[PDB]
Design a protein around this nucleic acid. Sequence first.
RNA 1: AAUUGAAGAGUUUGAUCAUGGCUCAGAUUGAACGCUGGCGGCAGGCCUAACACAUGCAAGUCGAACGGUAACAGGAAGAAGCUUGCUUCUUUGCUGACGAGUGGCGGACGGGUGAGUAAUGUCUGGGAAACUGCCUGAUGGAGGGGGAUAACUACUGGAAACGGUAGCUAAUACCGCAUAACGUCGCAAGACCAAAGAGGGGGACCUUCGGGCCUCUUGCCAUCGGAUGUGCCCAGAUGGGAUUAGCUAGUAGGUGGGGUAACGGCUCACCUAGGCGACGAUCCCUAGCUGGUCUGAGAGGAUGACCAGCCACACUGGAACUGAGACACGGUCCAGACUCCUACGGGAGGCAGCAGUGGGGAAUAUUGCACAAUGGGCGCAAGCCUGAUGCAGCCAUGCCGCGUGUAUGAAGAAGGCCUUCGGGUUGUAAAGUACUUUCAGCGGGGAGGAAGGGAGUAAAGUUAAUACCUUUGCUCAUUGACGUUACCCGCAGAAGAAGCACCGGCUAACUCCGUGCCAGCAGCCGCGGUAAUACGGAGGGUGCAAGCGUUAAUCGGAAUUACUGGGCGUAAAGCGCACGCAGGCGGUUUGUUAAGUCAGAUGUGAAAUCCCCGGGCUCAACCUGGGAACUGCAUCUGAUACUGGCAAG
Lengths: 85, 71, 80, 205, 82, 62
Amino acid sequence: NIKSAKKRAIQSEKARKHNASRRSMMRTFIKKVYAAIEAGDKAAAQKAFNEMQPIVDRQAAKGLIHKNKAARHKANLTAQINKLA
Amino acid sequence: VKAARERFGRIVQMHANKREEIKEVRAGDIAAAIGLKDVTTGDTLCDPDAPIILERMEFPEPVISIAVEPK
Amino acid sequence: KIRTLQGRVVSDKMEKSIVVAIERFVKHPIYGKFIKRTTKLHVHDENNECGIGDVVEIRECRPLSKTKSWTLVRVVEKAV
Amino acid sequence: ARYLGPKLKLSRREGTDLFLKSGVRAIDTKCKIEQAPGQHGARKPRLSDYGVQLREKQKVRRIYGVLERQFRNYYKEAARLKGNTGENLLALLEGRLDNVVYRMGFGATRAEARQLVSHKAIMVNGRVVNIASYQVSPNDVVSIREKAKKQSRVKAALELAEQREKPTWLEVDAGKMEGTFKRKPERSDLSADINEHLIVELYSK
Amino acid sequence: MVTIRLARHGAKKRPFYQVVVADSRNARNGRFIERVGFFNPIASEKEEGTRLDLDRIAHWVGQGATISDRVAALIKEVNKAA
Amino acid sequence: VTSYIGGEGHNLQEHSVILIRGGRVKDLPGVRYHTVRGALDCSGVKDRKQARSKYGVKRPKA
RNA sequence: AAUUGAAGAGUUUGAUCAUGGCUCAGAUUGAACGCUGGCGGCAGGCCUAACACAUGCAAGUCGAACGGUAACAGGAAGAAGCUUGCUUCUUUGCUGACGAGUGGCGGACGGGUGAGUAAUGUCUGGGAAACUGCCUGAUGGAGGGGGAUAACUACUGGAAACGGUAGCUAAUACCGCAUAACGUCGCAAGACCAAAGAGGGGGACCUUCGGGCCUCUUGCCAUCGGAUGUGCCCAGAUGGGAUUAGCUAGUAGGUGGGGUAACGGCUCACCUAGGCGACGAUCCCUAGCUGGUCUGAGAGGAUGACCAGCCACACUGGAACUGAGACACGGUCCAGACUCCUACGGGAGGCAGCAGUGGGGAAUAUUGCACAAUGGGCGCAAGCCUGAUGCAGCCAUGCCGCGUGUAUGAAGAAGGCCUUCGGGUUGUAAAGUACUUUCAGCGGGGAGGAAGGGAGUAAAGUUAAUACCUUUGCUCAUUGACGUUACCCGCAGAAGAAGCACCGGCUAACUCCGUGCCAGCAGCCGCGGUAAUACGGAGGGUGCAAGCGUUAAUCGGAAUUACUGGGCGUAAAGCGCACGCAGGCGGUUUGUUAAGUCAGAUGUGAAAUCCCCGGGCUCAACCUGGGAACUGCAUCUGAUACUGGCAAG
Ligand SMILES: [Mg+2]
Ligand SMILES: [Mg+2]
Ligand SMILES: [Mg+2]
Ligand SMILES: [Mg+2]
Ligand SMILES: [Mg+2]
Ligand SMILES: [Mg+2]
Ligand SMILES: [Mg+2]
Ligand SMILES: [Mg+2]
Ligand SMILES: [Mg+2]
Ligand SMILES: [Mg+2]
Ligand SMILES: [Mg+2]
Ligand SMILES: [Mg+2]
Ligand SMILES: [Mg+2]
Ligand SMILES: [Mg+2]
Ligand SMILES: [Mg+2]
Ligand SMILES: [Mg+2]
Ligand SMILES: [Mg+2]
Ligand SMILES: [Mg+2]
Ligand SMILES: [Mg+2]
Ligand SMILES: [Mg+2]
């Protein structure tokens, strides 16, 4: 709106699309782990947890998920992957 | 011709097709004064130190009357 | 020392959630008569310890539910 | 802000000379003191308790030449200040520069004193002070400006002034035309039949 | 960041500052953490004029406060080094 | 509301725009306001000389 | 030294006392209106329509992040008209600098408004499960690679808004890989996570002669601190209504999953069947809260403009995205009401930011000057931006100052007015005569707000360096919007400057004339039907004074909602009579408790305001240092008469 710092709008859009896509896959990975728990496969759970740990941590670093969230996932995923598996 | 003073503000000259703005208006010119409070048609605007009444044209005097009610 | 609070139990059946009433006198702001003031609080007691009528000592704490920010420390007297 | 009008009129109303025409001779009469403050002036309207109460302050006001608001504000201050609210109203009044300069004889009349103060013809401790109402402190020194020193007015003023009851709380000159405010006068060392409790009784209700 | 600065508190044409510690974001005459001195650019060569609880400035400066170029000149002049 | 028109004489007719004051007339129960002479379409009292500030009469040419 | 101060009057009656309402004296105001109006200082100024808005301004900034050249300027990988070291043309981004673009930071501050919110807030006192840009302390890291894309170029659609295809490119934009603890998960064993470069200068050695290299200054990543900010929780207080009595399904609790920065029905599945309310839930009405403001002797009553703190809102309803921070005042999306632009296909906008218009109204201002100062954003800096701010303009809206002259002047002029025709009054008032010249006018002169930055230079400050950088002296040019500043000095002459209400009692101030229950007055009683101090004019007086009245409004007097501080036989007022749940209250002794109650201590009760004492503007208003005050709240420790709880009598 006539204030040329409306470049902020086009800027933070590129942001939303970037964030969206990264934030998307780190979710679909966390899912893979919960699926394994539901499938019951102790191996694929601890396997899929190993695959997701770097993602959750990296994104938290890059500042898309933030720290304590990263913790909370691998935290209670762990709790469960070795609660019957 | 009203014994009150007015303070000039914005001034406009209708300028072929644009209400152009002015800060000064000299003698021999015409323009419209925005915002003047109580100045009717025929009044003289003179220098407060050098007061004068001018001629004032004449007021044609109506020839027709009709009564009106507000529907 | 621990900012605690004495007061008697009213209502019992809730499954680790005992409601405590806390009477208190106070002088009327305009007229001076000292008047009663009940103050009800939803209190957490792990493993349904108290029961209706009990006098209990409690302390403020981290939120535990919609209106529930107190747990007990002691009981004191019970029967009715 | 000034009265300006006919002054004996003010005096005859109060039934006593207020030295508003002090200038020279007469010291009353050549006015017909009392006997007609108006057309019905030569009457004794037996006036109420509100009456005397008003007239007595209406005197003080007229003595020092002070109009209502300033006067009221003086009343407020006298109250507030520690002390007998009655006398320190007069204190404030007497401490006035325009009064002080008169008590010192630089003008025949408190009015003439004012005109001097206003025309930048007077300095306190070296520094020129223009405003008629300047509350002067002890040890201060009002002095006439050399720029207009012992000319017509002030000569005569000192002259009949000297021939006036000569104050106590101030030391004046005449050669250097300088005076020292020694201290605030006590309720004792100024008076006539001028009450206060009336001027106070009045502003309490 | 928190800053020590001047909040104009005089009156028209006769300003009277009030040096103060504050969150830089607040208004000049606004919200402030603590008062820590003053500065009267009139004053007159009388007895008083400028005052800085230098010990407190120093303390806040210890926790990373910052200082106006003008508070600076007012410290670097009330001295504290010789 | 019904309103009083003080002073000797007035213009004031069916379409006059006036300024109403407040202040009763204890001879006219129900009349609880005055119409302010000299305001808006009400003229001041012709030829009056005393208390002109009430009754909207201007000083007569010193 | 510092919350040390309490006033009554008129009116019911033939008269009286009581009762009781109406009325008045005061203070106050964001006021308005009528008549009137000289200046200055300080302050205030849409209270109504959170009605609708034309126009301009109110948020940018970094070339020391990057590719870069559109314009400027310089230099020229060098050229005319000849005006041969002085010009104006073409090149070359070379350097200064800079439109557009990427990027970074800011746009969540600053400012406006009170719609919503009666408790999702505010206030006071506590609390635990939290994040926190820039600023700061400490410790190390800062290696090595990859893919892109704006700009640009070429086609190309629009009236405009806007773009569309294809291809090309840089970085501190983007993603892997490495590195990996005092970080995260985990009992551990172990797994796993990041990053960025850029400038100034420079001896050698040197190279594709770009710079490697050396140095200083910045920036980048990680962890733990500090600081500030923010989120969350509890108790108590913070309007009126019973002609609102019942309310409640994620409802109240639990368990386990999910979720957030974090605790939590926050969410979801199941189990329990709870939860709230006569100490007022629920539902109605009204409303931003506070510091404080006004009044009052106080307790109270009234109030929340201006200043400062908190909250909420941003055309209306709704939603999220970016981000440390928003569910965003001059951002995005949807929808609605509305307005505007169009070449009819299509577009755009939201002043409760400043100024301003219309409208509404009894009523509330300039489409101003400037970043000189204080402060805020970006920047190494210079600087750019700043309708915050500093000033000015408008309005007697308030407060406080000052003026509109000072003396002199009598058989007391004229004129007016009353007169018992003697005179009295207006009135020393006027004139006349001496004198002064503030403030306005004119001419001079001239503080303070200006501290800094900038050049030079000298300093074991660095460093390979006599560079660069930094600091500090000194030196030299310089920086006000207000501004014809404040203030001073000269000039002429009383010269330019007084209204408004009242005069029957309350109430300070009295007569003539006109009028004749007429015209009219009137806050209350009441005046007027031929001698009206009450109407209207005059003379005179009284009170105020650049204001004065009227209206409107809050408190006071009003002890007339009576806690302080009242009543009910006849004045208003005891239910027609009892029984009785809840409530209030409770004989007498001891023990015990320590809730009430009392004592102390320690925290906090923002600053401003009120008060005290000082200081500064010529005084005052105003500004200001320090203090007292904030009578409250909480906590800890004691006391145990009285009150309450418990025991036993
Ligand atoms: Mg005045
Ligand atoms: Mg650029
Ligand atoms: Mg890695
Ligand atoms: Mg759970
Ligand atoms: Mg869980
Ligand atoms: Mg509202
Ligand atoms: Mg009361
Ligand atoms: Mg909206
Ligand atoms: Mg984000
Ligand atoms: Mg807007
Ligand atoms: Mg209108
Ligand atoms: Mg009388
Ligand atoms: Mg007659
Ligand atoms: Mg009359
Ligand atoms: Mg009362
Ligand atoms: Mg009674
Ligand atoms: Mg009765
Ligand atoms: Mg009975
Ligand atoms: Mg305070
Ligand atoms: Mg006992």
